[PDB]
Amino acid sequence: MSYKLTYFSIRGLAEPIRLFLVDQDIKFIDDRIAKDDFSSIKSQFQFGQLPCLYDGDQQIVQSGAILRHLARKYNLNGENEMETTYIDMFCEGVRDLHVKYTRMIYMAYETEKDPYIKSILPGELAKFEKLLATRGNGRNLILGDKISYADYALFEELDVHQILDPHCLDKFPLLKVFHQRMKDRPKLKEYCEKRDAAKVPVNGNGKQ
Template sequence: MKTKATIKTVHIYQSNAILRHLGRSFGLYGKDQREAALVDMVNDGVEDLHLKYVTLIYTKYEDGKDEYVKALPGHLKPFETLLSQNQGGKAFIVGNQISFADYNLLELLLIHQVLAPGCLDNFPLLSAYVARLSALPKIKDFLSSPDHVNRPINGNGKQ
């Protein structure tokens, strides 16, 4: 006899709530509560920097870009430090399996490399991290796909 499973539909509207839901649903939230807390911390740090980036791009690009780029190393250093504390930077941002925070951090670092080429030059672990994650087959395929390549980074065309 076959059993029919009922799956309840959930409507989620906030991007970070969606990320966390997908992380829990697909095993992208760390292996235990400690790692989940670290994944949350990293993702919140990514979101903090992303908010600064969005503010720059949409409200003060012409007057604020130089100052933003000058301050960027201070914002990137905590991520480099976290990587150094996890298997010497040879793994993911938390633990030894990819998390939703890795995907979010990778996207943020890639757009910053467009904004400020060379911004990772003084961060060897972050540089290697971007290269390592970008080389993962599905990520590599996506990054080279027309859907990604032909899509503007920002709605206003600034980068």
């Protein structure tokens, strides 16, 4: 295959890219590296880190760059400058939430999970609930009727946050419905079931 995605055997940073590839029926080698095997190959990557997408002869690190590249190549990058900018802005906001999430998971799970759920996460979700409403009244996908790369990022972020706090979307009807809509896309539902069967952890420390 001409695509290989190299990452750890967790959802982590790679998962939005995996979701994009699966939902767009782009076949790829899902090259999942065990933690102890990474030091031997680390210098092969331009910043010594994963994920890495090999796209033919091109070696592309940086999760944001990988997803934006795929979006251009497969016409999931919006239809005009305003759209392209908007989904970039939106997806970058998703990455900011993921930074907060990961800091709590890796650095302070036992003490910071509950204050995160109660006192950080709701305000962050509220920003997305408001923003989502600006296209299609937020009642379909981020750009309205046409899927874009940002939808996969938002879906994964909402999904991992529901694992963390099953009630977190209760009071955010647009986000709750978006998550429902995405999970019901058949290629994503099938893949979710394979991923559950494989007992894939969200994060590298087994907490979630």
